[PDB]
Structure formats: structure tokens, C-alpha cells
Amino acid sequence: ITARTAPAGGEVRHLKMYAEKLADGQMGYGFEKGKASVPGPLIEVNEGDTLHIEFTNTMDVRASLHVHGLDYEISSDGTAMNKSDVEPGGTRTYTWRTHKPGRRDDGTWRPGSAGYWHYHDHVVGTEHGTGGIRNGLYGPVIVRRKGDVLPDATHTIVFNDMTINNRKPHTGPDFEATVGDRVEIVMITHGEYYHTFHMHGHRWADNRTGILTGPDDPSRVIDNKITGPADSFGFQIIAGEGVGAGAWMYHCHNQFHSDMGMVGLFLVKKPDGTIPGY
């Protein structure tokens, strides 16, 4: 494999994070005051790393940080039940851990933390975060196994109720690549609706990484993926492979949802910077 690959983990990492009310009524996470985004920033770590997140709630209401997939003690589960949220103006240090897979004392096989995960609020509006999630308090988390193939770029597409990344209908987002780039999609669903994520001109493997290990990998190959509230998956594709440059649609294939605006463009450019037909 002459492609870049993930190294072995085991670092202790530190991170400051804020929750911020945005001028338009939304709420968003950020690594710096004044730089919050919806989706929130991407967190990426290696199996076996530990992450300490000093989280500050700059909002006028209680807020929290709850994560999927990774190891965390009950003091870091981000629920009010377990006294794990943060009052207005407060600050709390959450700890997430990850581990490599391996053999248990009893001979069984313990799975590792690697995968396409996510984090979101758990106490704004209700004790399940219905208000925070709706306002934009969600973001992606990636845990890499040693040897995993690394991309040229990562993009995050979140189906939040009937919007993509909390955008107005029929406003994308759109992404650009050049034929040949190795592009990574992290795909997360939130809210109360069910969807199917479809991408013209490309396909991926329905397994942890989106890639086949080789001629023996039994994972099915798909271009349409059903998803419900709090599902998360990811894949990599070679932009334009076998199909060439173009304005390639991605959307929810639910005919009502795409009619209502859940559509965007994956713009794959020729080497001269152009898109066939434009």
C-alpha cells in the first residue's frame, strides 16, 4: 500500500471546546470563541489515544457533550441524570478513551473503538438534547485503526430532520474535488425522520471503513444507504473513478425529502478546473 496509513495510537491529547449561541438563533460547537460551526469541528484520534476536552458553556442555558462509540466513564456521559452537564458560563473537563481490539482473558475477542462516530448535546430543550440537536449542537468523531487508509480530505454531511447541515432547502452544501482525489465522507443522521443517502456516479462498501479489504471481503457494495436518528457511517471514494468529472448529485432518495430540498452537489473537476457542461 503506497497510500498514507494511520499510525498506532496511545497519545494523551488535550482540547478546548466551546458551546456558543449564534446570532441567528442556532447553537454550535467550536474550538475557539467566535469560530463555532454547524456541524461542529471534526475530532480525529487513533485507537488507544485518550482525549481530555475542557468544555466551556458560553450559553445562557445548560448544555452538554455526549459521544457515541468511545469509552467514557459515567461522569462524562453528558446527561443531567448523572450530573454531567454544564451550567451557563461553566466549564467541565470531559474524558474520552479508546482502545485497540484484542483477546480477553476468557479467550473471546474484544472489539476496538475504531469507526465513524459523533458527538452532540444531551440537555438543551429536553433531557435528550432535542433542542440542542435541532439548533446545531452536533459534530463528527473519527477513530482510526492502525493501518487505515488516510484521505485527501474529509467532508461531513448531516441529515438533521429535513435539512442538510441545518441549511435552507436547496442550498447544498456543495463540495469540490478533482478527478482522482481520495475523498472521505462522514455521514450522520439526527432528529425524528428516516432517510436514504444516495450518491450519483459513486459507490462504497457497507462496512466499517467503506472500503473492501480485498477479494475475500464479503461486504456488500451499495450507493444507497438507509439511516435513522443517530446513525453514523463513513466511506472513501476515488472522485470520478470510472465515471469522469461532472456535477454529481447526492441527496436523500426519499422522493418527498428531495423534492423538499435535501439535495447537494459533489462537483468533480477536470485537471483544468472545469465541470463538464459549464
DSSP structural state of residue 126:
S
Number of residues that bind a second copy (CB under 8 A): 92
Q: For the chain, how many residues are written?
A: 278
257 near Cu ion, rule: CB under 5 A: yes
**Range 56-115, binding ligand [O-] (CB under 6 A):** 66
Closest CA to 36 of 23, 46, 45, 49: 23
The label of the residue with cell 441545518 reads: 166
247 near a second copy, rule: CB under 8 A: yes
Of the candidates 200, 203, 208, 270, which one interacts with Cu ion according to CB under 5 A?
200
Indicate the residue type of 227. T
198 near ligand [O-], rule: CB under 6 A: yes
State the pairing for strand pair 232-238/182-190: antiparallel
**22-61 footprint of a second copy as x/- string (CB under 8 A):** ----------------------------------------
CB 234 within 8 A of CB 240: no
**Range 59-88, binding a second copy (CB under 8 A):** 68-69, 71-75, 77, 79, 81-83
d(CA 49, CA 98): 6
Q: How far is the CB of 106 from a second copy (least distance, A)?
A: 4
Q: How far is the CB of 162 from ligand [O-] (least distance, A)?
A: 17
| Residues contributing to the annotated binding site | 66, 68, 120, 122, 195, 198, 200, 251-253, 257
225 near Cu ion, rule: CB under 5 A: no
202 near ligand [O-], rule: CB under 6 A: no
CB 248 within 8 A of CB 188: no
| Cβ-based nearer residue to ligand [O-], 66 or 145 | 66
CB 54 within 8 A of CB 90: no
d(CA 255, CA 217): 33
| Cβ-based nearer residue to a second copy, 25 or 218 | 218
Q: How far is the CB of 248 from ligand [O-] (least distance, A)?
A: 11
89-117 exposure pattern, b = at least 16 Cβ within 10 A, e = fewer: eeebebebbbbbeeeeeeeeeeebbbbbb
